[PDB]
């Protein structure tokens, strides 16, 4: 049906039902988060606050996942065991990481109920990303005492970051248990993040998939790829801004410097991906808490294996946390080559031309000659175009399916990115 007949029913078929479902899904999680935020302001003993958030986490998990929340609860218990047995050693990170690895593998063998296991990962993952975190923050000395059972449980089951919420370090949660005054910036941040989450949801559901035929007079295999990539990006940004809102509602996600308290828990920066500078900025700004967790607790450890062999292990860990699907695993493996080759090639180009063409906008104290020349703008724009093209290629797998689906979807595109990356690596090794 034509554009007019589409827009005549757009609002009644897309704008109201999508937002209705988006609000019906979270009207209870937001209520529980607000109840926790208000309850943690009565000057209660800390153990009672941790017990309250444990109860809230149980109730929230039960409300989302009917009774399969055991596959999370169990994990939590298991984690604490591996934290209490090796509490004295300096291997806490390694033991907790091996436990998480064994648990996720034993889960991905598709023995236990998979219809609901494959939809709890978004929560289960977080728990893992928390436990391992502590296991290393105690080793390097960034956390003093091994927490008591109630503190650890109230950390894993933090009602703000249990369902969608991002990973937050143990100290960034302890400083939330103390609680901060209900300022106006707090409500402002919560409302802004909720509005942006709803906007990204309604913009991903059916303004994305119907982008180029109707919203554009253009219309193929590349246009569908780009619209699928945009739909996927915004379907993520929904969860991102919603997690940011639920974590700023429960009290967490705030920095303080020179008695200045600011709520700036950023999870996803959409303007660094839709108008990208480089694929490194796309990856590290697709999910900021996870992009910091992986760089700090996986890459920095496996760095002994060599730079590339550590980047690849980091992407393997990221493809294991998200849940192993062949399209997602292929994307998160190709991203390793793409990002590494682009980074090192831009590095060589900047060292040769003495220009500011690094994969990140340099600091003001760089030793480059061409800081703002038109050639620098042209190179940055060409690499941004390559980044948009890599995104439109990779995100084509997430339309709305094992090796056959991926091979077919990438054969319709004639393997454009996997040849552009090879060409860029050849170009890098030739001008070496």
């Amino acid at each position, epitope marked *: 049906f034509s554009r007019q007949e589409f827009f005549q029913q757009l609002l009644q078929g897309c704008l109201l039902p999508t937002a209705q479902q988006g609000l019906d899904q979270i009207w209870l999680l937001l209520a529980i988060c607000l109840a926790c935020r208000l309850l943690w302001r009565l000057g209660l003993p800390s153990y009672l606050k941790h017990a309250s958030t444990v109860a809230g986490g149980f109730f929230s998990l039960y409300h989302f996942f009917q009774l399969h929340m055991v596959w999370v609860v169990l994990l939590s218990l298991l984690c604490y065991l591996v934290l209490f047995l090796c509490r*004295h050693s300096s291997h806490r990170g390694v033991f907790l990481s091996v436990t998480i690895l064994i648990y996720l593998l034993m889960g991905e063998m598709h023995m236990v109920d998979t219809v609901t296991w494959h939809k709890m990962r978004g929560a289960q993952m977080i728990v893992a990303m928390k436990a391992v975190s502590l296991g290393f923050d105690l080793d*390097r*000395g960034e956390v*003093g005492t091994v927490p008591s059972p109630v503190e650890f449980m109230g950390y894993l089951y933090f009602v703000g970051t249990i369902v969608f919420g991002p990973w937050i370090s143990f100290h960034s949660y302890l400083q939330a248990v103390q609680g901060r005054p209900l300022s106006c910036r707090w409500l402002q941040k919560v409302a802004r993040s909720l509005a942006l989450a709803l906007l990204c949801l309604v913009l991903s559901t059916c303004v994305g998939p119907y982008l180029f035929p109707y919203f554009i007079p253009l219309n193929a295999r590349w246009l569908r790829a780009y619209e699928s990539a945009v739909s996927f990006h915004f379907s993520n940004y929904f969860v991102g801004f919603l997690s940011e809102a639920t974590a700023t509602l429960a009290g967490a996600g705030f920095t303080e410097e020179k008695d200045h308290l600011e709520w700036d828990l950023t999870v996803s920066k959409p303007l660094n991906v839709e108008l990208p500078r480089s694929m490194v900025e796309v990856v590290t700004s697709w999910n900021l808490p996870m992009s910091y967790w992986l760089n700090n607790y996986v890459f*920095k450890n496996a760095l002994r294996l060599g730079t590339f062999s550590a980047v690849l292990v980091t992407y393997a860990a990221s493809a294991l946390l998200h849940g192993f699907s062949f399209h997602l695993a292929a994307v998160l493996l190709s991203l390793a080559f793409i990002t590494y080759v682009e980074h090192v090639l831009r590095k060589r180009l900047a060292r040769i031309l003495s220009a500011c063409v690094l994969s990140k906008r340099c600091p003001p104290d760089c030793s480059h000659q061409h800081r703002l020349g038109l050639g620098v703008r042209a190179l940055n724009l060409l690499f941004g175009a390559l980044a948009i093209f890599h995104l439109a290629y990779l995100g084509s797998l997430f339309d709305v399916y094992g090796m056959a689906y991926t091979v077919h979807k990438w054969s319709e595109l004639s393997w454009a990115s996997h040849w552009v990356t090879f060409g860029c690596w050849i170009f890098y090794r030739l001008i070496g």
Partner: antibody, heavy 119, light 107 residues
Framework: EIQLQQSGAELVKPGASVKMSCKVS????????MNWVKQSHGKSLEWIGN????????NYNQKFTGKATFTVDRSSSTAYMQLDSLTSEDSAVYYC????????????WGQGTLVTVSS | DIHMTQSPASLSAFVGETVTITCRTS??????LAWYQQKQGKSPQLLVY???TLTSGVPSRFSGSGSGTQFSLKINSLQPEDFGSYYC?????????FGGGTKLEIK
């Protein structure tokens, strides 16, 4: 019995570098963190930093970064700290201390080396 | 950085009295705080950790208590070998900072 033997006193010219040594004996060296602490004369203690002997990642105090570097020797179970560009403000006693394990309190202390900077 | 103040800077009592040293923390540490004792010319020794738990081999007269931003060590029935500097040191997270140091002296 746990014993953290330490090097002898040092007298260094201003601007030079010094390298201490804390030899551990009494437990598995790669089991617990090793903190380095500085105490002036008649003053309070200051936490220079720590090193994890299992994986050699370190953790410095921001006031002592770039001035003290930590290294380890697992074969002889010895933790070294190197102070660079010493001034007259670094004449103090330096202790090594094994973390308690569960908590990060300094359970077993060394004996300290007196580092004096003069001409 | 967490600023730890400690009071009093220097006190003096007879043998067999009861003394209370206080440590006030700028930020809020939940219960993470240790008390070390250092005699004249020796390395410190861990006396109390978690602000109440006594270490292995310490007499039962050292009784530390408190929580939040106000902790206190209580030395009752003072003994001759209990004279020296006492440092409070939080262990809530790097970087750990020590207190000023109360110097218990003879009287």
């Amino acid at each position: 019995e746990i014993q953290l033997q330490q090097s002898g006193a040092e007298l260094v010219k201003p601007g030079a570098s010094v390298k201490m040594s804390c030899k551990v004996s009494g437990y598995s060296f790669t089991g617990y963190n090793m903190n380095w602490v500085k105490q002036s004369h008649g003053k309070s203690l200051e936490w220079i930093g720590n090193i994890n002997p299992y994986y050699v990642s370190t953790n410095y105090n921001q006031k002592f970064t770039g001035k003290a570097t930590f290294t380890v020797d697992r074969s002889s179970s010895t933790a070294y700290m190197q102070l660079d560009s010493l001034t007259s403000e670094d004449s103090a006693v330096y202790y090594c201390a094994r973390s308690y394990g569960s908590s990060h309190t300094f359970a077993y202390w060394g004996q300290g080396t007196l580092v004096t900077v003069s001409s | 950085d967490i600023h730890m103040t400690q009071s009093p800077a220097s006190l003096s009592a007879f043998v067999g009295e009861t003394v209370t040293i206080t440590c006030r923390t700028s930020e809020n540490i939940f219960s993470y705080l240790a008390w070390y004792q250092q005699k004249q010319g020796k390395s410190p020794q861990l006396l109390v950790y978690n602000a109440k738990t006594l270490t292995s081999g310490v007499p039962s007269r050292f009784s530390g208590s408190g929580s939040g931003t106000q902790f206190s060590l209580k030395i009752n029935s003072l003994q001759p070998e209990d004279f020296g500097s006492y440092y409070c040191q939080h262990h809530y997270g790097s970087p750990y900072t020590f207190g000023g140091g109360t110097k218990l002296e003879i009287k």
